[PDB]
Amino acid sequence: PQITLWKRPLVTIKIGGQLKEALLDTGADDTVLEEMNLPGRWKPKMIGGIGGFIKVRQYDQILIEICGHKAIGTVLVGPTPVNIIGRNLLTQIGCTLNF
Amino acid sequence: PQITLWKRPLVTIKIGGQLKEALLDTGADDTVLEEMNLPGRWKPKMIGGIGGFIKVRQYDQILIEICGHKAIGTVLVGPTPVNIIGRNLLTQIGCTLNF
Ligand SMILES: CC(C)CN(C[C@@H](O)[C@H](Cc1ccccc1)NC(=O)O[C@H]1CO[C@H]2OCC[C@H]21)S(=O)(=O)c1ccc([C@H](C)O)cc1
Structure with a gap:
């Protein structure tokens, strides 16, 4: 889409x-x-961003489905305020920026 | 592109x-x-990030050019780990995700 x-x-x-x-x-x-x-x-x-760092747990070869598009890769789990799909999985589903 | x-x-x-x-x-x-x-x-x-909240200076109606596309909007200046272009300006240049 x-x-x-x-x-x-x-x-x-x-x-x-x-x-x-x-x-x-x-x-x-x-x-x-x-x-x-x-x-x-x-x-x-x-892992670090705006406001400092948080401790996460890195799992490898995790399958997640994004709007019907399957992707498998590294997933970091921790006290993030929001679930974040990063480039490591965005590429697998063929996602691009366009302007 | x-x-x-x-x-x-x-x-x-x-x-x-x-x-x-x-x-x-x-x-x-x-x-x-x-x-x-x-x-x-x-x-x-x-503003809050993955790691917490930071103090920033808010500049309104700033002119920014991104890959030749002009945008005029709010720019926050502060201790961010990376210069990031957010949705307030990505919309101005007609940016979308596709997959
Ligand atoms: C800063 C960029 C370089 C990196 N980040 C992604 C960025 O998109 C964040 C995502 C986000 C975080 C908390 C709450 C909402 C969105 N957005 C953001 O901070 O936005 C700010 C500005 O505008 C306002 O809107 C929202 C919050 C406010 S990260 O989260 O820190 C991150 C670091 C390391 C990894 C792995 C290890 O690679 C993955 C993700």
């Missing part, structure tokens, strides 16, 4: 069997999701 | 007569630039 930027580019995603709202964020190298209890191994990581 | 997301969507911007590199950030409501001097009046404002 085509998503304008009048409002936040929020879309429905499906990760680990659950549906959520997430931000298609060209400003994020990687995907960051709100706190959730995923299974599997993980490694700790610190 | 059409911009793929396998690399950071960095572009050259012109502001206050100076050129700078900025990130096209669809996950940002507002445009936030690193410390710099801009002409005109400004009011103090707060």
Whole structure:
């Protein structure tokens, strides 16, 4: 589809069997999701933005579906105020900026 | 143009007569630039990011050129880790996401 930027580019995603709202964020190298209890191994990581850093848990090879488009890659889980779909997954679904 | 997301969507911007590199950030409501001097009046404002809230100087009706497209809108100046072009200006240049 085509998503304008009048409002936040929020879309429905499906990760680990659950549906959520997430931000298609060209400003994020990687995907960051709100706190959730995923299974599997993980490694700790610190990620930074406006306001400082937060501690996240990095999971690898996580499948999420974005508006019917399947994508699998690295997902960071921690106390983010919003679910963020980063370029690592935006590319897999064929997402581009256009102006 | 059409911009793929396998690399950071960095572009050259012109502001206050100076050129700078900025990130096209669809996950940002507002445009936030690193410390710099801009002409005109400004009011103090707060903005939140992934890591918390920071103090910024709000400049209204600033002229910015992004890849040749002119925009006139609000520019926030403060301790952001990266110069980010937010949706307030991305809409002015007719930017959209597509997939
Ligand atoms: C700063 C840019 C360079 C990076 N960021 C993406 C940016 O899109 C954020 C996303 C966001 C964060 C909190 C609440 C809403 C949106 N937007 C933003 O800060 O916007 C500001 C300005 O306008 C206002 O609107 C919203 C909040 C305010 S990050 O989140 O910090 C991030 C860092 C590292 C990774 C991995 C490790 O690669 C992924 C994501």
